[PDB]
């Protein structure tokens, strides 16, 4: 049992760090760097990322959180707290002399009940209404510098995921890494930012003889004996008379001598993902090599070709008036610090739209979703025949820590309000009577915008319980390779 208890204190201490780093009143932390420096951040994602830990059970908590950051850019603070609080009940592991398998079956049984309980307090959303989506996304715009342009961030965040979603395939897959490439352009301000309705390539301009502005471009996707192939591979492209030569690999110096002779734009170092968006934008086709081109490899339907030097930096705009399962964001700012604020804050809002569009269902946040769940499992434990009911009730008492931290971070009497918070869920409906993060007192969530998506909490409790299962399944540490 010494190894069973070692994973408790290994995770209980990690949860203690980010216990007060939750909510809009999240407390800051002081991390002493080895060079005497101090970082005064408050995000639990970056705090534990730099802190080196000695126990292996605590190192798994970091690998689990990073995978959560890719799915949803928030809520990861509670992922470790619930997994740390679930394992903090040592009365049922060692003092009661129960097996770990006894408790794993109890948590897995409680997992299926928590999932159904969160869907009972769900609510549909009308994504067609941009005003109803503004109340949802504002949960991340508050307490930020982007609050001055909240309406602009709403238009940039909500409409961008609509371009990535392809609802004809049935699954309605949304991928931010491939179809939502966010790029920056110097010059301008946050107000000057807009969403490009097409593809933008970050290729700088090397030669002066290139088509600067064309309203109907044409895109083509792909000493003696040395210049033999170079002149021929370049002469097969001008048969279609293009305006921008988009190559996958790098172009040689002599092959560019014919690209500048033609006074056409020369683009290179383009991914395979990037060319498919172009082929779907202007209807072109990706050919293996330049020598086997056909008539279909043209840019009919393209918006315009512009490689203008905007903000002392060239940018190839090949946008169009279509949404070819892709999008491109144009972030404008006077400085890099301001650009770094809008670039990262929109990624927190852009991922919230991903959860709503895949499943338009919300949940009452601010401690309301936990009490709605913990109240359902407590009454169910009195009628659950089996020894698993005891650890089944510990989950009802352990999930109360999420609202406990929000009231404790505010400084109000957490013991007085949390006990009365149970009565609101006991008598009245569980979909209301939440907790105000800023004020600290109780308030209903229908009147406030603390509503979180459904996919954020589903991955939370699935990964919070799965983390405790993986840690309680351990009983010995093996050293060797």
């Amino acid at each position: 049992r010494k190894v069973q208890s070692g994973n408790i204190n290994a995770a209980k201490t990690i949860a203690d760090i980010i216990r007060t780093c939750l909510g809009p009143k999240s407390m800051m932390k002081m991390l002493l760097d080895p060079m005497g420096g101090i970082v005064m951040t408050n995000d639990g994602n970056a705090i534990l990322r730099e802190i080196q830990v000695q126990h292996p059970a605590a190192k798994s908590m970091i690998e689990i959180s990073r995978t959560q950051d890719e799915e949803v850019g928030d809520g990861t603070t509670s992922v470790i707290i619930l997994a740390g609080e679930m394992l903090s009940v040592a009365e049922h592991f060692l003092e009661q002399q129960m097996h770990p398998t006894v408790v794993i079956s109890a948590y897995r049984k409680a997992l299926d009940d928590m999932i159904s309980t969160l869907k009972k307090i769900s609510i549909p959303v009308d994504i067609s209404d941009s005003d109803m989506m503004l109340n949802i996304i504002n949960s991340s715009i508050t307490t930020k510098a982007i609050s001055r342009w909240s309406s602009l961030a709403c238009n940039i965040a909500l409409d961008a995921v609509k371009m990535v979603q392809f609802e004809e395939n049935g699954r309605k897959e949304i991928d931010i890494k491939k179809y939502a490439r966010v790029e920056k352009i110097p010059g301008g301000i946050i107000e000057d930012s807009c969403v490009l309705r097409g593809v933008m390539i970050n290729k700088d301009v090397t030669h002066p003889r290139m088509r600067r502005y064309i309203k109907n471009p044409r895109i083509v996707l792909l000493l003696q004996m040395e210049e033999e192939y170079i002149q021929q591979l370049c002469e097969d492209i001008i048969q279609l008379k293009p305006d921008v030569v988009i190559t996958e690999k790098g172009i040689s110096d002599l092959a560019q001598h014919y690209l500048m002779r033609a006074n056409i734009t020369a683009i290179r170092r383009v991914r395979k993902t990037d060319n498919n968006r172009i082929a779907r934008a202007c209807g072109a086709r990706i050919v293996s090599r330049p020598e086997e081109l056909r008539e279909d490899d043209v840019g009919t339907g393209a918006g315009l070709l512009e490689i203008k030097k905007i903000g002392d930096e060239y940018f190839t705009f090949i946008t169009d008036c279509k949404d070819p399962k892709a999008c491109t964001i144009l972030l404008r700012g006077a400085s890099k610090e301001i650009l770094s604020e809008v670039e990262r804050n929109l990624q927190d809002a852009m991922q919230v739209c991903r959860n709503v569009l895949l499943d338009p269902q919300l949940v009452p946040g601010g401690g309301a979703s936990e009490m709605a769940v913990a109240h359902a499992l407590t009454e169910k434990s009195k009628a659950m025949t089996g020894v698993e009911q005891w650890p089944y009730r510990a989950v009802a008492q352990a999930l109360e820590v999420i609202p406990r931290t929000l009231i404790q971070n505010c400084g109000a009497s957490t013991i007085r309000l949390l006990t009365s918070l149970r009565a609101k869920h006991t008598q009245e409906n569980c979909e209301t009577w939440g907790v105000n993060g800023e004020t600290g007192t109780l308030v209903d969530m229908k009147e406030l915008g603390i509503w979180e998506p459904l996919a954020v909490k589903l991955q939370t409790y699935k990964t919070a319980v799965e983390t405790a299962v993986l840690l309680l399944r351990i009983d010995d540490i093996v050293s060797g390779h």
Partner: protein
């Protein structure tokens, strides 16, 4: 300055110790004697007078609460709390460079301003049964476990009301406090008469007498010395028995002298007789007097004989040869009470005793001593309520109103003494801060609501322990004595003046 920092932090630690036993909702402290005695109590006088403290500086504060308990009888816990906070706030200015002499001048001005503030908010309500119950509730609630409140409240109130007439001042010696074991704790009630430890023990005695003439005596009815010019001279054990026949003539003949007085004064039926002799009595004298309907008691206390003179009215006698009818008394129901093991005499329903008996009942020894002090601490709280016709609201309501008067007050003597008034303002507000913690609520949130309560009228606002909202102490029946707060602010300023003026600490042996 270092001579003060040792004394400053000495009181701060003493503040954190005694703050958890203020009010009813606070905790208690244990007294480990080392010999086998263990005691529990919240009264700060017992935590300082009988307790031994390690620091000599804190030992001087113990003698303050000792004299404070002798004057008012309550409030010694908050006396040390204000003292610990006065030096806490004084240290904030001493770090800046202020001499302690100017700070004492600020307390002298605020002490006289706050004493004038009591004259405005004090309430001179008429003293009656309903109002004193509200006062006795305040003194006894903090000395019990939240169950003996209504039980002991009616006792202390009716006890003092029985011994107060013709505008006579109050005296604590007019109440005989007795204790009884082998019973529960909630059986504490009032006894109109006087309870005697030892009583008559013979089968031929009456179980109860509706009316009996009590004869007071001090005569020895056991084997005594020879009363004539003779002595005890014998040669064997049988010859010694002949001297018993001679010496007992001084004891046996005095038993019949009581019988002659019985047939003389009301010797008919429907009457009785009770002898309350302080000395011991022989069984032959018990059997001789038991058959005659005469109840003979022995082994009484010196003070019980003094109260017995008042109960019946018979004057104390010293010899039965000087017996007369003038020294005969009269009382109502005279019987014997039965406990699990022992039995006691009861002479209730007296004519004009002018002396009541508060009979305490409890099962344990250490719990009986807790109620022993609560009686003396409860009787004295209402004692000052009637002797001092004016009272003040409780619930810490005087402290929050006092902070409004002193902040809105400028010294007309000098400027730099104004900061001493600022320290005396935050020092008085520690009581609503202490009780907010003993109640389990937030310390500062309770202070905001009671301080934020304002209106265009005379508004008395206090602390609610059950909910934590502003409580009008006059509406709920929460009151104190006028001499308590007057002695509080008059005492706490003198001690803070004596300690802060200590410049150096020399080891004098």
């Amino acid at each position: 300055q270092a001579a003060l920092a040792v004394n400053i932090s000495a009181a701060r630690g003493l503040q954190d110790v005694l703050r958890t036993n203020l009010g009813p909702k606070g905790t208690m402290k244990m007294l480990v004697s080392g010999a086998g005695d263990i005691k529990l109590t919240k009264d700060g006088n017992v935590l300082l007078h009988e307790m031994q403290i390690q620091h000599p500086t804190a030992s001087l504060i113990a003698k303050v609460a000792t004299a404070q308990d002798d004057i008012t009888g309550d409030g010694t816990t908050s006396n040390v709390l204000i003292i610990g906070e006065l030096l806490k706030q004084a240290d904030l200015y001493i770090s800046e460079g202020l001499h302690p002499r100017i700070i004492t001048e600020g307390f002298e001005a605020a002490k006289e301003k706050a004493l004038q503030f009591l004259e405005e908010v004090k309430v001179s309500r008429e003293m009656d049964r309903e109002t004193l119950i509200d006062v006795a509730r305040t003194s006894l609630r903090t000395k019990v476990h939240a169950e003996l409140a209504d039980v002991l409240t009616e006792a202390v109130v009716d006890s003092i009301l029985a011994i107060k007439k013709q505008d006579e001042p109050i005296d604590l010696f007019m109440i005989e406090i007795m204790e009884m074991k082998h019973k529960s704790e909630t059986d504490t009630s009032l006894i109109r008469g006087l309870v005697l430890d030892h009583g008559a023990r013979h089968p031929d005695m009456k179980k109860r007498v509706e009316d009996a003439y009590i004869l007071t005596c001090n005569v020895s009815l056991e084997y005594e010395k020879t009363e004539v010019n003779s002595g005890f001279f014998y040669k064997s054990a049988e010859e010694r028995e002949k001297l018993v026949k001679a010496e007992r003539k001084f004891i046996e003949d005095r038993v019949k002298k009581i019988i002659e007085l019985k047939r003389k004064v009301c010797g008919d039926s429907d009457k009785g007789f009770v002898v309350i002799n302080q000395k011991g009595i022989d069984p032959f004298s018990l059997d001789a007097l038991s058959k005659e309907g005469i109840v003979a008691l022995r082994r009484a206390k010196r003070r019980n004989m003094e109260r017995l003179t008042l109960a019946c009215g018979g004057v104390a006698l010293n010899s039965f040869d000087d017996l007369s009818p003038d020294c005969l008394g009269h009382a109502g129901l005279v019987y014997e009470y039965t406990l699990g093991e022992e039995k006691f005499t009861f002479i209730e329903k007296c004519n004009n005793p002018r002396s009541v008996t508060l009979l305490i009942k409890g099962p344990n020894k250490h719990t009986l001593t807790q109620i022993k002090d609560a009686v003396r601490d409860g009787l004295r709280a209402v004692k000052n309520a009637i002797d001092d016709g004016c009272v003040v609201p409780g619930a810490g309501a005087v402290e929050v109103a006092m902070a409004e008067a002193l902040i809105k007050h400028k010294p007309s003597v000098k400027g730099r003494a104004q900061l001493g008034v600022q320290a005396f303002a935050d020092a008085l507000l520690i009581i609503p801060k202490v009780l907010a913690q003993n109640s389990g609520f937030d310390l500062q949130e309770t202070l905001v609501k009671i301080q934020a309560e304002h209106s265009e009228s005379g508004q008395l606002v206090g602390v609610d322990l059950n909910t934590g909202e502003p409580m009008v102490a006059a509406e709920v029946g929460v009151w104190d004595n006028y001499c308590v707060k007057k002695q509080l602010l008059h005492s706490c300023t003198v001690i803070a003046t004596n300690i802060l003026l200590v410049d150096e600490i020399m080891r004098a042996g």
